[PDB]
Every structure is written in C-alpha cells, then in structure tokens.
C-alpha cells in the first residue's frame, strides 16, 4: 500500500540507521516456563537475530543501558502493561523505546535483505506475501528432445513435495493446480483442485488447460479472505529464443 518507490526509500533510510544510530538489547527474561528444549530453540533463534543485525552494522549491547534504541524480546509485547514497574520492557515502553517481538525483528531483517544449465521459463511473484519469489525453469535440451505436446509440468499444492508449495492451508488441495510447458514456450494453467482456482479474477474450468499471459494473476483460497493467495506470472521471453536458437 506504500508504492514500491516509497518502500524502497523506507528501506534505504533504515539501512543507514542500522549502520550508524542503532544499539540493540535482547531481553533475557522469559514470561513462560519452558523445557530446556524450547528454550535452546529460542536461544538459537536469538543468535540468528543477533547475527542478522550485526550484518546490518548495528551495535549489540549486553546491558539495558542509557543508549538502547531497540529492545528485542520473546515475551508478549502487547501485555507489557501487566508487567512490574521494574521490568525492562515496562521502562523501555514508558520511555518510548522501540520494543519488538522475535517475529517482528525477523521480518525487519528480511525487509533489509537479510534472512544449473536450465533456463528460466517464468517468474512467480506472490502478491499476497505468504511466499517468496520463485522461478520456474526447464532444460532447453530436455525440452527439445520431448515430442509430446507438454514438455514439462509444475504442480502447485499444499503438499510440500510438490514443485511449488502453496503453504499449509486446509482449504487448499495437496495438488491444487499445475503449470504446463506448451511447445513454443507457451504456458497453460490446469486446475485439479477441490475448491477451485481463479485466473485474473475468473474461476477456471477444472481439468481444462487455459493459456497463460504476461502478468496473469492466479488466485486460490477464494471464499475465505485470509486463505486467499495470489500468484502473478511473468513469462521469460528469452526462453522462447534459446529454444529457437537450439533447433
């Protein structure tokens, strides 16, 4: 809802702040009691976050001191008003310090860019945001040696063994839809799902191959606003050329 240019500017400014004006303290206190397992799991998560922020050039202080700009905690940020007045999170808050959960910190790191011989057929960008950008690829050699009208098949589904994992959403099928590689670099959408697939906001006929176009939006999980997952297809035109080159 920010323009791409605005979000980039937001990133550029934060990147500078991390490198010059940032001193981060990690809360050591835990609000739940956890077996040493979950605790060493969250400790591993902490170390990841630390390394991430260090990459961005931020200071990591071991003490809740006079200079802290951000406090990163595991504990409930929303229930800080319930803590004792002596609590570090209470004092940071009432002094308008930035207090982030681990989930918020990880998301911030991700936003600052922290975290074969076969050509790109198309690039899939999730505009709902549940999935990072992935490319569909195919070997030009294998594709030209195939005489069948369908050169390759990519399956999308909740089953993590599929070519593209749609995420774990009960209303989505283990094999929801497929993308087929037509003969001249053409791409087809095939819905094999139980609850249906949409193309540019129109429900496609099940088990029917529909030609895909540049910037076509594929949406699943329609009916429940929070199960909705949109995928935009950008077709690589040079794939058609490396195919026409290697005849």
């Amino acid at each position: 809802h920010m323009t791409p240019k605005e979000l980039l500017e937001w990133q550029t400014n934060w990147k500078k702040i991390m490198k010059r004006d940032s001193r981060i303290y990690f809360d050591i206190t835990d609000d739940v009691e956890m077996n040493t397992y979950n605790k060493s799991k969250m400790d591993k998560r902490r170390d990841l976050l630390k390394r991430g922020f260090l990459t961005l050039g931020a200071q990591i202080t071991q003490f809740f001191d006079t200079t802290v700009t951000i406090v990163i905690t595991r504990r409930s940020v929303e229930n800080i008003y319930l803590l004792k007045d002596t609590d570090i999170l209470s004092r940071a808050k009432k002094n308008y310090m930035k207090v982030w959960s681990y989930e918020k910190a990880a998301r911030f790191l991700k936003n600052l860019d922290v975290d074969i011989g076969e050509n790109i057929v198309c690039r899939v960008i999730c505009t709902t945001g549940q999935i990072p950008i992935r490319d569909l690829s195919a070997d030009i050699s294998q594709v030209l040696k195939e005489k069948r009208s369908i050169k390759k098949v990519w399956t999308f589904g909740r089953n993590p063994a599929c070519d593209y994992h749609l995420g774990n959403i009960s209303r989505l099928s283990n094999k929801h839809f497929q993308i087929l590689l037509g003969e001249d670099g053409n791409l087809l959408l095939n819905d094999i799902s139980t609850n249906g697939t949409w193309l540019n906001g129109q429900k496609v006929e099940k088990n029917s191959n529909q030609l895909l176009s540049q910037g076509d939006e594929i949406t699943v999980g329609v009916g429940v606003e929070s199960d909705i997952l949109s995928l935009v297809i950008f077709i690589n035109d040079k794939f058609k050329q490396c195919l026409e080159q290697n005849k």
């Binding site: 089953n159 209303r171 283990n174 799902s193 139980t194």
Partner: peptide, 9 residues
C-alpha cells in the same frame, strides 16, 4: 501431513 482437503459447500 498430506491431509484430506477441507471441501467447501
């Protein structure tokens, strides 16, 4: 994992 899909009405 690999559960049966939650069908809509």
């Amino acid at each position: 994992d690999g559960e049966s899909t939650d069908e809509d009405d």
